[PDB]
Nucleic acid binder design. Sequence first.
RNA 1: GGUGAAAUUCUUGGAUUUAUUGAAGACUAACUACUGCGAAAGCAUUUGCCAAGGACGUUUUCAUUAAUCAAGAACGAAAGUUAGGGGAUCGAAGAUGAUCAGAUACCGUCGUAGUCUUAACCAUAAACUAUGCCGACUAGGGAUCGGGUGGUGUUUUUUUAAUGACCCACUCGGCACCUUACGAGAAAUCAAAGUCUUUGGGUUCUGGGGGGAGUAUGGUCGCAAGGCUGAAACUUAAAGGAAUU
Lengths: 226, 25, 200, 91, 127, 63, 94
Amino acid sequence: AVGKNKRLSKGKVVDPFTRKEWFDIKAPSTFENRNVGKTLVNKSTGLKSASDALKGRVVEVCLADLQGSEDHSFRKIKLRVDEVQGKNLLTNFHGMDFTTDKLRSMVRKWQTLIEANVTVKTSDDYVLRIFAIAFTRKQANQVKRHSYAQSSHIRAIRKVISEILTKEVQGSTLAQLTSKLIPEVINKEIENATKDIFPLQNIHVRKVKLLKQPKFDVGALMALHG
Amino acid sequence: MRAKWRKKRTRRLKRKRRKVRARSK
Amino acid sequence: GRGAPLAKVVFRDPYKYRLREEIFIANEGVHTGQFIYAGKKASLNVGNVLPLGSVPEGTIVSNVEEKPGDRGALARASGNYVIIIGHNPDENKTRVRLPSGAKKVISSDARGVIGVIAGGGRVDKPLLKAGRAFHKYRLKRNSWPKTRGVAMNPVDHPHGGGNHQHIGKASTISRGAVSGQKAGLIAARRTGLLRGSQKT
Amino acid sequence: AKRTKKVGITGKYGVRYGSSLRRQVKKLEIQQHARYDCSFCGKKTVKRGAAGIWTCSCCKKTVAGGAYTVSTAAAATVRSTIRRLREMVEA
Amino acid sequence: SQVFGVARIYASFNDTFVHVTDLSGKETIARVTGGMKVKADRDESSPYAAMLAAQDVAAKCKEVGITAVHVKIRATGGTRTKTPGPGGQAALRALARSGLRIGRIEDVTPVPSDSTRKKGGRRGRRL
Amino acid sequence: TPVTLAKVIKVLGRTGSRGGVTQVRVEFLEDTSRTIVRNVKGPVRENDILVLMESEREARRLR
Amino acid sequence: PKKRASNGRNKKGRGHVKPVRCVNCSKSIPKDKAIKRMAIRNIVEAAAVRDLSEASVYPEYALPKTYNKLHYCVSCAIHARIVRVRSREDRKNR
RNA sequence: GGUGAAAUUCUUGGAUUUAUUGAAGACUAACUACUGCGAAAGCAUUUGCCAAGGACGUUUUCAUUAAUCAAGAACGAAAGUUAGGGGAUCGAAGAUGAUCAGAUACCGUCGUAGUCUUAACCAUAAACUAUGCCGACUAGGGAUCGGGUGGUGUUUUUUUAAUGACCCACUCGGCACCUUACGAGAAAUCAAAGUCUUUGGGUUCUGGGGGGAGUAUGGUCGCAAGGCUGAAACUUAAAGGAAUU
């Protein structure tokens, strides 16, 4: 194990944290009190610099940490850093998804795993692929312990969910979109419009992906941090 | 011996016999 | 002498009252009476001549040139095309894939026609005869038939000589060899039949 | 009256040039000498004039295509792909 | 205060990795694997080696000043064992009461969706 | 060598192929209320104090 | 002879079933023929939650679980004691 | 990196590792069950088009147009063959390192054909439900899929119509399951393997002790490997099936 290396160098010192420095992150204002944390980036040399290194960075943070609450424990978001003015590197919204434990305990036998996804874009040239998931419900006084649904019912539910999802996505920007994901308001009218077809249960929004991005947009990026 | 390997040996013998007959005729 | 058909396009001279007739390699899918738009502002249609800096990523082009003003250099044989893999704005250069598989950066001012050259899949029918090969090579050059160096006399060829038809020395020839010694394989990095995919 | 069993058009070659080459040239010659139709009229009068040139006696339109076929699978794929990029660019 | 760094613990049946990185993940605080702690060439994935590696990582993090750590466990991952290694639990337990305070326990093992083929043939292992 | 004197309260049973190793659940008087599972070679009864060299060395059933 | 009413597994009127690979021996077996165990465990072992609670940032919280579905073949299950052989009469239960 | 232990091999020109992006190719986990479709082989992502099929209702139509099949024809797992694209993983041959008296294998690392897709051959398997198709009858019980009918039923809506999703009762067509044996069977077991010594519903195919042998030959199809039909000479008194100690 330890004594196994025969030779190391094919051709044939100081602690890096002295040069390493600390930089605080600032999440967009669409969330609550930020208190993101702190990252380590190498010294701002004349060739690489700290700012350009911070440009290509993403920080994974749970939504419960941002909100200062509990019911958002099983939701987490990546924050994409875009610019830094010094010790307060600002970031934006990248994507939201649940935990592996949440997904695995969500998926259970004797149920259904209706799913939907549509490739859409927002007003500000922001293309996002919105994912939606749905499970059939066992109604009260039911003795049939499988809650199976017909393929036509699945098709209709998926079509309705996609229609409402596109209606929500169209005519909105990232700030309002995130401010409406946060309180979990999509599932309300999703289940309202899909409850007639099937009772439905465990309605959540799976994940979003950031595919295409417009220009830097400093003027409105500064709005998310003051 | 296994029937599969016996059959394979039979195919090999059949190929050899066919080659011998072809070279004779 | 060329498998690819030649398309004749007439263009009005914008500085004098006359008709200037170009010589174009007939792309696959073109037909008589179809208008051909050549220029940067022209749309993306088969046969149109556009600069390489205007076509989107993944475009298939033909009759491209190494430098602007070369009147079309690369991808001029029947059934070949060039695939635009990327664009680089600063010091504008379009990264492309050639039919041979090599990737070369060329200036965005280079112009290539849209589509593939007609007559693709020319070499699938075997010549099947000496007559067809002779007629094909007669229209090209005096490069047929060719006599083997083993049957060649020893003075006529380094490989020749001896009672039996054998090379004698190594067939591979170094790049540093002088004229007269370059008889056989030249700079053989890997000799013999390759096993598996070429992975080009 | 089915004068031949399988050789077909290559019956002119007789006992020559092997069998696999004869079959390949038979298939390629069938594809070459088959008549097609002009996309501008819809009448099966398209014939082959030269290497890659498909002429007609009625539509009077010459089309540049494959050596032995009016349209090639690779050519059609390239045309569809180019149309796809054009639509993506303008939309 | 209580600056947060992630642990990125890798548990396998042959070796254990405790590679503490920043919250973003582009850092190298005490990568230290569980291979140099024991000279056995067989006991690399063992609770003792895992605990020693966790203690070394905790000491290095205390030296660097990080006090709050998140833990992201992962198994071998892929077309293979899929189960967490015995060393992961021991490393987590050792790192818990040895300095840094942990939070947001989470598993991040990558599990494919019917991709490629499992090595071993159609007849499987025949030891 | 940092020692830890720990008194046992419950012998789990005899482990190992040859039965020379016995499992036990043991805690230490100093800063008590936390216990670990240890393995003893010799005969061990209840209310027996043993000197552990190790602290974070939770053991496992022997073979 | 006819050792079992169901020849391999619950496959009547279906025929071909897409196969899956065993978790350990990586042997290809029909999906219904794989002994599937719904193993729901905890990513913190026994007698460790107490030590992991007070040594964790934020009060309570955490308490997650791991959930994996293991497809054990017949030989692997017999070797690992996942399923044990029994008498002829006990086979008909469940 | 790997295994019971090792070893080949990649490693201060960053090996493993962390984070981002891009390309490729394979597949459709978890949902996934004694559940669905199809003549069979066989089919699990979303959407659009083309049609096709089963079940149910029907006071609609023809009128016996019906059941099985020599010959013949269509489809037909995987692997293999010919000519192209692709060729990400796995990976027969092969190259090494282990173990062993020997290991050309089981074990570790690479690795061609192949694995994927297009146009054509291959016509095979434990292709099993080792159970032919059609039609009539025969102990019960529960659950489930599709369809149909009745609920002074529940819920969802717009507390209340429709539309759905549930619960109660009935029925047809299926996948099937459980206790028993009026019976069958040599038994294992079977609601069909029953209505066969109280022997007969119609009908097609296959077999007469085990080897030789699914071999030789004669034909036929196929580029090829091979596919269909298919013996005789000679030898033996046991070859076999189910259960019991």
